[PDB]
Amino acid sequence: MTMMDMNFKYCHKIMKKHSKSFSYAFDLLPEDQRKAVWAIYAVCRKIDDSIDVYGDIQFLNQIKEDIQSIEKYPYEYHHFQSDRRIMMALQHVAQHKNIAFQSFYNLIDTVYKDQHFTMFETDAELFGYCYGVAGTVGEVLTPILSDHETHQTYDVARRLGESLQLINILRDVGEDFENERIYFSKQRLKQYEVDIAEVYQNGVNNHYIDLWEYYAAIAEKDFRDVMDQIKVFSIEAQPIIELAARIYIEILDEVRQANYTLHERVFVEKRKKAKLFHEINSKY
């Protein structure tokens, strides 16, 4: 029951706490891959949460320097500046897998940027943001969840990450609005004649529903194209990745069934998640 085990179990704790869908899915991987996913998760979570620690970029620059120490000196003992437990585990993972460190740097730049948030002019900017926050995560995970990483593998993984993020945005419209974030593009908002503030005030309508469903068709189409290439991923990871996706896809029906409410976070019941997994296991 070693010190390293304790490091991973802490990372596990962070993921079960914060990520109900992805926890449920990725914990079903073999031990060595699921532990690698916990570690990558906890690093990404620290990066995403780092600003509201003091109020400024301090903890974030520490995280980055810790990651750069590992990249540069993967086998030396580091006195980590941010979170020792998470960084020891990432270092362990890096000694065994070809981590794309530039994908973590991309994620971190995206977090820096989001301080001076400004709304996206076009869907092209929005999709670029999706890459920064979530495509990158797919990239980091690639060597973990596939046997032989090629460009096709990274591509599928990126596309998956980016559509899960688009689903995320689609679940959290109202919550995001309260935090003075709107993610739909000004182009697409103007086109559908939608003022998010107005809809947060007055309830949904046919305009907002149409704009919401525009982006949903994009996420679902991207989901289907990923599923068609599921076989880039190792045989053990295939069903797990399919479940993670299906669960997050189900969030879209949850939004619908709640009439596109901007005043709560909808969710897929645990008992539903198990149903989807049952469904997926028959196939496999």
Ligand SMILES: CC(C)=CCC/C(C)=C/CC/C(C)=C/[C@@H]1[C@@H](COP(=O)(O)OP(=O)(O)O)[C@]1(C)CC/C=C(\C)CCC=C(C)C
């Ligand atoms: C490392 C791992 C599993 C996740 C990343 C953990 C973090 C925190 C990243 C910081 C930026 C953020 C917040 C991104 C959003 C994750 C959901 O937020 P979370 O808060 O956990 O859950 P929920 O909002 O539902 O409560 C997201 C949608 C990206 C999901 C992308 C995946 C999974 C790659 C798919 C490709 C393959 C599997 C090849």
Ligand SMILES: [Mg+2]
């Ligand atoms: Mg969360």
Ligand SMILES: [Mg+2]
């Ligand atoms: Mg969100």
